[PDB]
C-alpha cells in the first residue's frame, strides 16, 4: 500500500484519484492519499475551484518511485515530483500518518472497476505516448493535442497516440481499395496488430488510456483516438475471437464508469450506432450493447 504525500494545499481544489474525487479547501490541513493499491497504474488529477479551466493530472506507478505533490505558486498548479532520498520520504510519510493528515484510497473489496479500466495500461507505454523522459510520471491536461491533430502546434506537449486514418495509404492496399475500405481486417491485423502494436494487449492499453484521458480531462483528441480504435475493430470482418470477447468487457466498464451528464459530449453517435447495429461485429458486444440500451437509449 503506497502513498502520495502533499506538501500542503494552498488553493481550493477538487482532487481526483482514478474514478474517485473529493474537495479540499484553501489552506485545509491536507497531506495526501495513503493505501494506494500496488500493481496498477494510477492517475491523480486536479480541478481548481477558482478556474475550472484546465483539468490536469499525473499518471504514475508507485513501483517506479516515491512521488509527492507540491503546489507551485509561480506556475499555479499542483506539481508531481520524485523524492530520491528514501529515508527522507518514509519519515515524511510516517509523520503525516501519525498525525492522520492523509485520506485513505477506499478500495472497497468487491470492486474491480479500476483493474478493469486499466487492465492493459502499462506505465512504460504511457511514457512513449507522453514524452517527458526526465520524469517517471506523465502529465496530461484538457488542452493537449495529439500528433494526428497537429498534422491537421508545440510538439513537446503532444499526445503521441498511434495515428489511424481510414482514408490513407497505410490503411488501403493498392488494388484492394474497396476490399480494405469496407473490411478493415488488413489494417487491424497486419498493419496495426502485427506491425505497430505487436499484440492485442498493447492495442487495448492505448484504447484504455485514450478513454481515461477523455473522461478525466475532457481531452478531445483522446476521445477521437478511443473512438477510432473501437471503429477499426468493429469494422474488421476478421478479428481474433479472444479480442472480441475482451473488447466487450473493456467497453462495458468504460460505459459503466462514464458520468451520465457527460455522455452528450464523450460519445460519438455515429461510431456507436455503426459498431452496435451495422458493423461486422454488431453481434459480438452483448454486454456493451445491453448497458448502452438500458442507460443511453436516447443517443441510439
Amino acid at each position: 500500500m503506497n502513498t502520495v504525500p502533499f506538501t500542503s494545499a494552498p488553493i481550493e481544489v477538487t482532487i481526483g484519484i482514478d474514478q474517485y474525487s473529493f474537495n479540499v479547501k484553501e489552506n485545509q490541513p491536507f497531506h495526501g492519499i495513503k493505501d494506494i493499491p500496488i500493481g496498477h497504474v494510477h492517475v491523480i488529477h486536479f480541478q481548481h475551484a477558482d478556474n475550472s479551466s484546465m483539468r490536469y493530472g499525473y499518471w504514475f506507478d508507485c513501483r517506479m518511485g516515491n512521488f509527492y505533490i507540491q503546489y507551485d505558486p509561480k506556475d499555479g498548479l499542483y506539481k508531481m515530483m520524485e523524492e530520491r532520498d528514501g529515508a527522507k520520504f518514509e519519515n515524511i510519510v510516517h509523520n503525516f500518518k501519525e498525525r492522520q493528515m492523509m485520506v485513505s484510497y477506499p478500495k472497497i473489496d468487491e470492486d474491480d472497476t479500476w483493474y478493469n479500466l486499466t487492465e492493459f495500461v502499462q506505465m512504460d507505454k504511457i511514457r512513449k505516448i507522453v514524452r517527458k523522459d526526465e520524469n517517471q510520471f506523465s502529465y496530461v491536461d484538457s488542452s493537449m493535442t495529439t500528433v494526428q491533430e497537429n498534422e491537421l502546434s508545440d510538439p513537446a506537449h503532444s499526445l503521441n497516440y498511434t495515428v489511424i486514418n481510414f482514408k490513407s495509404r497505410e490503411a488501403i492496399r493498392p488494388g484492394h481499395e474497396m476490399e480494405d475500405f469496407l473490411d478493415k481486417s488488413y489494417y487491424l491485423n497486419t498493419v496495426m496488430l502485427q506491425g505497430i502494436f505487436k499484440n492485442s494487449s498493447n492495442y487495448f492499453g492505448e484504447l484504455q488510456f485514450a478513454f481515461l484521458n477523455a473522461m478525466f480531462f475532457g481531452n478531445y483528441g483522446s476521445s477521437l483516438q478511443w473512438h477510432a480504435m473501437i471503429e477499426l475493430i468493429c469494422s474488421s470482418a476478421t478479428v481474433p475471437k479472444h479480442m472480441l470477447d475482451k473488447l466487450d468487457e473493456i467497453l462495458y466498464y468504460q460505459i459503466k464508469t462514464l458520468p451520465e451528464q457527460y455522455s452528450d459530449i464523450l460519445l460519438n453517435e455515429r461510431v456507436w450506432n455503426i459498431c452496435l447495429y451495422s458493423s461486422f461485429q454488431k453481434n459480438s458486444l452483448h454486454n456493451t450493447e445491453k448497458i448502452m440500451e438500458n442507460k443511453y437509449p436516447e443517443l441510439l
Binding site: 482514408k167 481499395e177 474497396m178
Partner: protein
C-alpha cells in the same frame, strides 16, 4: 467545398476539371422468373466523365461481363466507377490531369477519394446542382456505342460538337444541360423537336444536329417550353 449556383463560373475557368456521373454504370431489366419471382438481367452501361470547359467526354463503356459472379452490384458499381476514373487520370499526361473532380452523386465521394489517394492535390467535390447527365443515354450515338460493345472500351467524344467555334463554354454548357434536361423530362417530345425538320442533319462526326444560330434560339426556346409544361403536367399548374 460543394459546387452550387453561387460558384458556378469556376467550371469555365482555366483549371482543368471533370464531372463524373455514374448513373448509367449499372443498368438492368428487372423481370419475372418461371417460379414467379423477379430477377434482373444487366445490360451495358457507361461512366460519363466530362470536361465542362472543352466538351471532351471520356465515355467508358461498362460491359456486362464486369458484373459476372459479383455480389452487391449497386455498391460495386461505385467502386468500379472510381477505379476507372483513377485509371483514366493515371493514363493522362500530368499537364492534362484535372485539378478537381466533381461527382454528381455524393455516394461517389469516398470510393473516388480512396482510389485517388495517390493524387492528394486533386480535389474531389460534390455538387448541390441536380445535373441532367443521366440522360446521356438518350443521345442516339452514345446509346448506340454502349449497346453494341462486346468488351470494355473507352470512346472519346466532344459533347459540344463545334459549338465552341461560335459560343463560349458557359453558353455551351447551358445549351447541353437544357438539351439533357429536356430529354430527361420527356424524351419523346425532346427528340421530336430536335429532328422534326428533315432538312437539318447530324454530321457523321457530331452528336447533335447542324443548327444555325437562329435555329438554335428556336430550339432552345422549344426545349424551355417542354420543361415548364412537363413541370405543369407533372404539377398541374
Amino acid at each position: 467545398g460543394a459546387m452550387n449556383s453561387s460558384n458556378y463560373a469556376e467550371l469555365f475557368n482555366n483549371d482543368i476539371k471533370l464531372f463524373v456521373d455514374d448513373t448509367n454504370v449499372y443498368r438492368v431489366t428487372v423481370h419475372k422468373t418461371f417460379e414467379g419471382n423477379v430477377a434482373t438481367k444487366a445490360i451495358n452501361g457507361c461512366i460519363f466523365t466530362l470536361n465542362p470547359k472543352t466538351g471532351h467526354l471520356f465515355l467508358k463503356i461498362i460491359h456486362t461481363s464486369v458484373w459476372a459472379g459479383q455480389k452487391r452490384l449497386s455498391q460495386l458499381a461505385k467502386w468500379k466507377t472510381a477505379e476507372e476514373v483513377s485509371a483514366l487520370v493515371r493514363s493522362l499526361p500530368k499537364e492534362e490531369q484535372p485539378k478537381q473532380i466533381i461527382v454528381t452523386r455524393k455516394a461517389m465521394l469516398d470510393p473516388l477519394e480512396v482510389h485517388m489517394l495517390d493524387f492528394p492535390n486533386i480535389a474531389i467535390r460534390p455538387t448541390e446542382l441536380r445535373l441532367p447527365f443521366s440522360a446521356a443515354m438518350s443521345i442516339d450515338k452514345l446509346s448506340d456505342v454502349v449497346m453494341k460493345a462486346t468488351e470494355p472500351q473507352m470512346v472519346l467524344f466532344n459533347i459540344y460538337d463545334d459549338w465552341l467555334d461560335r459560343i463560349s463554354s458557359y453558353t455551351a454548357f447551358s445549351r447541353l444541360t437544357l438539351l439533357l434536361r429536356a430529354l430527361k423530362t420527356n424524351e419523346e417530345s425532346a427528340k421530336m423537336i430536335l429532328l422534326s425538320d428533315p432538312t437539318i442533319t447530324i454530321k457523321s462526326y457530331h452528336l447533335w444536329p447542324s443548327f444555325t444560330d437562329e435555329q438554335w434560339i428556336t430550339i432552345e426556346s422549344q426545349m424551355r417550353d417542354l420543361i415548364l409544361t412537363e413541370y405543369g403536367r407533372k404539377y398541374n399548374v
